[PDB]
Amino acid sequence: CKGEVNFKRSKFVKVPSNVAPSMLFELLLTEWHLPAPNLVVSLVGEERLFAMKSWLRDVLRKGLVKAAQSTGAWILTSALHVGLARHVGQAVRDHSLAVRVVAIGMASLDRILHRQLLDGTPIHYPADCPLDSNLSHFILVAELQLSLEKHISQQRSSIQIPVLCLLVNGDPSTLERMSRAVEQAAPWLILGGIADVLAALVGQPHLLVPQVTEKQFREKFPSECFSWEAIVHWTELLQNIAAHPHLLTVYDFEQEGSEDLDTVILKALVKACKSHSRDAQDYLDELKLAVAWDRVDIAKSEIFNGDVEWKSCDLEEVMTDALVSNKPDFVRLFVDSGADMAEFLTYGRLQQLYHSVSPKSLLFELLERKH
Ligand SMILES: [Ca+2]
């Protein structure tokens, strides 16, 4: 079901559970006419008591600023998540006001207030719970999000589209869902909340945590004391999760020696794709993203370390992209990677390059007037 909220209208798509993810994908793209996804970053952690220090908030702000600058992506921030997420919605709205990034409010309907008012045309839902009015879209209804992620990581010049999850100041309730994410072939990045526990407990000489989990749950958020059976279940859960480390990665941005947000993103992405397979056609999308960030160090060190083998045949599209974007370092790297200009350059390709002249340029006006 399609609906609009004249609040500047926000879209509502009825989300019946166990629906086809491809159906929702097609509905979103068609009805919303939004650009193709170059990246899909989904949030998994949000809490009202969750507070962000100035450093982590700034590196989150600078990161989203750089993301909206060149690449643009989709931030699957669940609506009706009142807390720190509303500030994120206001911030992304202000930064987009200042290629573009989009945010989707994939959220249920039970926790929303005035749900009967919107169920049965500006639906006024003024509640002092209601959803954050900073977002301009929503999907009205964890398994749905996981299946949507598994679907997006399967949609496919044969290019893929990356998908990543970013958790921030999570609660011990997402852990179960998090386990499914380990089986969903999706990379995960950890920094605030239970994230500190998951980080300090991911690398240990002892695989199982029969007693350290209790000490962690006691030292961290000691307001709620859970049952011992729950702690044993969650210890087994964390064991089964950390059984697969090559998809999970943690980094500390407060150490003052941290690399930029965009860097670790691509680092974890290539780390995941390396364990996924070694197909040259695989790393393409992420590689394109690297060009979008002008990141050459990680391009040469990680991608072109000699592990994967490159053939002159596949580099054509990415080389053209690097050329039109005016980034000579990557051109040098590619031509040193075996790509030969002698056979790549054709008169049709050369005309294409001329067809790629920017309209506001002077050469464009000169050629147009001459024509
Ligand atoms: Ca890939």
Q: How far is the CA of 299 from the centre of ligand 1 (A)?
A: 14
Q: How far is the CA of 2 from the centre of ligand 1 (A)?
A: 33
Q: How far is the CA of 329 from the centre of ligand 1 (A)?
A: 22
What CA–CA distance (Å, rounded) separates 240 from 246?
13
Structure tokens at 365: 């006006």
Q: How far is the CA of 300 from the centre of ligand 1 (A)?
A: 17
Q: How far is the CA of 127 from the centre of ligand 1 (A)?
A: 43
DSSP H or E run through 93: helix 84-97
What CA–CA distance (Å, rounded) separates 7 from 134?
10
Q: How far is the CA of 151 from the centre of ligand 1 (A)?
A: 14
Q: How far is CA 61 from CA 54, 55, 57, 349, in A?
A: 10, 10, 6, 40
The resolution in angstroms reads: 3.8
3-state secondary structure of 6: strand
Q: How far is the CA of 346 from the centre of ligand 1 (A)?
A: 29
Experimental technique of record: cryo-EM
Q: How far is the CA of 282 from the centre of ligand 1 (A)?
A: 4
User: For the purposes of burial, counting CB atoms within 10 Å of the CB of 96, is it exposed (0-12), middle (13-18) or buried (19 or more)?
Assistant: middle
Q: How far is the CA of 35 from the centre of ligand 1 (A)?
A: 19
Residues 6+ apart with CB under 8 A from 178: 44, 167, 188, 241
What CA–CA distance (Å, rounded) separates 74 from 38?
8
What CA–CA distance (Å, rounded) separates 287 from 266?
9
What CA–CA distance (Å, rounded) separates 109 from 105?
11
Q: How many whole angstroms from its chain centre is CA 261?
A: 12
Q: How far is the CA of 164 from the centre of ligand 1 (A)?
A: 11
Structure tokens at 191: 């920094």
User: For the purposes of burial, counting CB atoms within 10 Å of the CB of 155, is it exposed (0-12), middle (13-18) or buried (19 or more)?
Assistant: middle
For the chain, what percentages of helix, strand and coil (3-state, to nearest 5) are there? 45, 10, 45
Q: How far is the CA of 159 from the centre of ligand 1 (A)?
A: 8
Instruction: Report DSSP letters for 134-203, one per residue.
Output: T-SB-EE--HHHHHHHHHHTT--------EEEE--S--TTSHHHHHHHHHTT--EEE---THHHHHHTTS
What CA–CA distance (Å, rounded) separates 132 from 129?
10
Which residues have a beta carbon within 5 Å of ligand 1, which is an ion? 160, 273, 282
Q: How far is the CA of 285 from the centre of ligand 1 (A)?
A: 6
Q: How far is the CA of 178 from the centre of ligand 1 (A)?
A: 22
Q: How far is the CA of 328 from the centre of ligand 1 (A)?
A: 24
Nearest to 101 by CA among 126, 130, 128, 65: 65
- Contact indicator for 319, 344 with CB cutoff of 8 Å: yes
Q: How far is the CA of 325 from the centre of ligand 1 (A)?
A: 21
Q: How far is the CA of 72 from the centre of ligand 1 (A)?
A: 17
Q: How far is the CA of 274 from the centre of ligand 1 (A)?
A: 9
What CA–CA distance (Å, rounded) separates 39 from 162?
5
Q: How far is the CA of 156 from the centre of ligand 1 (A)?
A: 10
Residue with tokens 């999308």, as numbered in its chain: 285
What CA–CA distance (Å, rounded) separates 143 from 176?
11
Strands 106-107 and 139-140 turn out to be parallel
Q: How far is the CA of 76 from the centre of ligand 1 (A)?
A: 20
Residue 74 bridge partners (DSSP): 40, 102
Q: How far is the CA of 195 from the centre of ligand 1 (A)?
A: 26
Residue 106 bridge partners (DSSP): 139
